[PDB]
């Protein structure tokens, strides 16, 4: 006959929700992400490729992306907690033009000094974007953009916003499955699965409409979406060639410190050395539109013989209509109307520097989560900063047309960075190992 037996440590797993702990190369300025606070990374992550295994993946229904979003916002609030707040800076500022070149404003306002009975008069430079007047008729009196919503918190200068790679390790009894399929679109069954205890280097860089310093594709351009035909769903694309970009801040600001209270200081720009220079970015037009041609021919496989046309941003909020990123502590906002301005036909071929100049905007008062409050005031970085990033993917949003036309327009898609984390966690899924296996055999012999 047959008797039931129990197997301990059996190799089975089920999809479940669980917490995750950090892992990084802890060693020194601390980093907003508190990478030194978590567990130090292993010298070499043990990665094993499972043979004869086919597993179903779903990058849109994954729980790691939501957990990662909650952990990043929690670490952000944690980092801003011991720092000084901007509660006394809501005074009516007096700004005029600086000595296009009208973006900066030379402000002047009153401020309470360390003495509770005395005050101090200071001056600082603020951008027009983070400046809002009381009324549209007076003129020369302005306020902060986030004053009637919440009080911003000045970031501590002892920490840096460098995107330090963090490894999202799984707890004991749990594992992370990796899909090594060539050109996997992120949804369906994977024919080449691998397992690992901790994920690879995940840089929590913040980007909009473009993916900076992301993971490059394996062999071809991959388009990821749960429903490509659905117009309300976002579209994530990946590139095989890292499109370089050079973003600099030509303005040479002078960091100054003023004491707004006992034991607290406020940092702002004093003056500018030289002259006014508009911040911009550079990109090779040949490689950029060559990759655009590859993306168009890849999209041609899903929309048939229709021609792919790219348009600029629709309009509205500056955070979703412009490509933003944190460059060495300074938040950038570049206009992408020169990168999504072209059309591609079926017989079209892209066929020297010829760089493209992309105008950019700088904002110190940012929210970075689309929340109704809890803003952050980015401190000014002294000197001239320069940033170089590897463009590996972008976000797309198709216009809600009738679809019967020969052409459809695409716009630079936006989001709350959840899709950005999805673009890096698509290859990973969280499972729960059940070491209790049940199987019968002819025992009792």
């Amino acid at each position: 006959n047959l008797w039931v037996t129990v197997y301990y440590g059996v190799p089975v797993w089920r999809d479940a929700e669980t917490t995750l702990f950090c892992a990084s190369d802890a060693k020194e300025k601390h980093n907003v992400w508190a990478t030194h606070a978590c567990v130090p990374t292993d010298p070499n992550p043990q990665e094993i490729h499972l043979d004869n295994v086919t597993e179903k993946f779903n990058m849109w229904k994954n729980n790691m992306v939501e957990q990662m979003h909650t952990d990043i916002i929690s670490l952000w609030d944690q980092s801003l907690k011991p720092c000084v707040k901007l509660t006394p800076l809501c005074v009516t500022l007096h700004c005029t033009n600086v000595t296009d070149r009208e973006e900066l404003k030379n402000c002047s306002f009153n401020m309470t000094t360390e003495l509770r009975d005395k005050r101090q008069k200071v001056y600082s430079l603020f951008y027009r974007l983070d400046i809002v007047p009381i009324n549209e008729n007076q003129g020369s009196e302005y306020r902060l953009i986030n004053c009637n919503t919440s009080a911003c918190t000045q970031a501590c200068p002892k920490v840096s916003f460098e995107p330090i790679p963090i490894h999202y390790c799984a707890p004991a009894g749990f594992a992370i499955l990796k899909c090594k399929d060539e050109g996997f679109n992120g949804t369906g069954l994977c024919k080449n699965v691998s397992t690992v205890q901790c994920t690879h280097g995940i840089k929590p860089v913040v980007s909009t409409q473009l993916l900076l310093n992301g993971s490059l594709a394996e062999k071809n351009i991959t388009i990821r979406s749960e429903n490509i035909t659905n117009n309300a769903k976002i579209i994530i694309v990946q590139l095989v060639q890292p499109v370089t970009i050079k973003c600099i801040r030509p303005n040479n600001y002078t960091r100054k410190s003023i004491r707004i209270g006992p034991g607290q200081a406020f940092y702002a720009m004093g003056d500018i050395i030289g002259d006014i220079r508009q911040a911009h970015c550079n990109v090779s037009r040949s490689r950029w539109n060559k990759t655009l041609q590859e993306v168009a021919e890849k999209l041609r496989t899903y929309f048939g013989n229709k021609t792919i046309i790219f348009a600029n941003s629709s309009g509205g909020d500056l955070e979703i209509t412009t490509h933003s990123f944190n460059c060495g502590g300074e938040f950038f906002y570049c206009n992408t109307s020169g990168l999504f301005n072209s059309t591609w036909y079926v017989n079209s071929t892209w066929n020297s520097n010829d760089t493209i100049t992309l105008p950019c905007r700088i904002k110190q008062i940012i929210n970075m989560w689309q929340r109704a409050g809890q803003c952050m005031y980015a401190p000014p970085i002294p000197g001239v900063i320069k940033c170089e990033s590897n463009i590996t993917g972008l976000l797309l949003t198709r216009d809600g047309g009738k679809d019967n036309n020969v052409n459809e327009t695409f716009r630079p898609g936006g989001g709350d960075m959840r899709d950005n984390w999805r673009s890096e966690l698509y290859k990973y899924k969280v499972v729960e190992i059940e070491p209790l296996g049940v199987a019968p055999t002819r025992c009792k012999r």
């Binding site: 008797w3 039931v4 301990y8 440590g9 190799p11 702990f21 397992t195 070491p435």
Partner: protein, 127 residues
């Protein structure tokens, strides 16, 4: 030899060899800051401890604690699976076998517990 969770695609007759690598990996800056990462680390450690103890108490009450494979007095029922004696040990892996008996795990656990308790009651406590 394969590493951790490296024999999942193999058949049940061959995947029961490297069980020690999965059994060993069930549990594997001194000051804790109790921050965002600290609280998650503590929760992960407590959850891992609870998971190991929860799956270990079953083996403890079944009379097979500290043993990777053991045989009990509960006979197999054909209602759970109508397959033969060795068609699963030579052609099916553990991934396609756990879903077939997933609806009868609780019943098997209760029968196993009552049979083991009855066996210990009849063996021990002579008078």
């Amino acid at each position: 030899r394969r590493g951790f969770l490296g024999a999942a695609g193999s058949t049940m007759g061959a995947a029961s060899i490297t069980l020690t690598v999965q059994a060993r990996q069930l549990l594997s800056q001194h000051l804790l800051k109790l921050g965002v990462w600290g609280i998650k680390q503590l929760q992960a450690r407590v959850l891992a401890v609870e998971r190991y103890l929860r799956d270990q108490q079953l083996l403890g009450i079944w009379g097979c604690s500290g043993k990777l494979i053991c045989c009990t007095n509960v006979p197999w029922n054909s209602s759970w699976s109508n397959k033969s004696l060795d068609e699963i040990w030579n052609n099916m892996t553990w991934l396609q076998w756990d879903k077939e008996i997933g609806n009868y795990t609780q019943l098997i656990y209760r029968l196993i517990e009552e049979s083991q308790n009855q066996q210990e009651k009849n063996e021990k406590e002579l008078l």
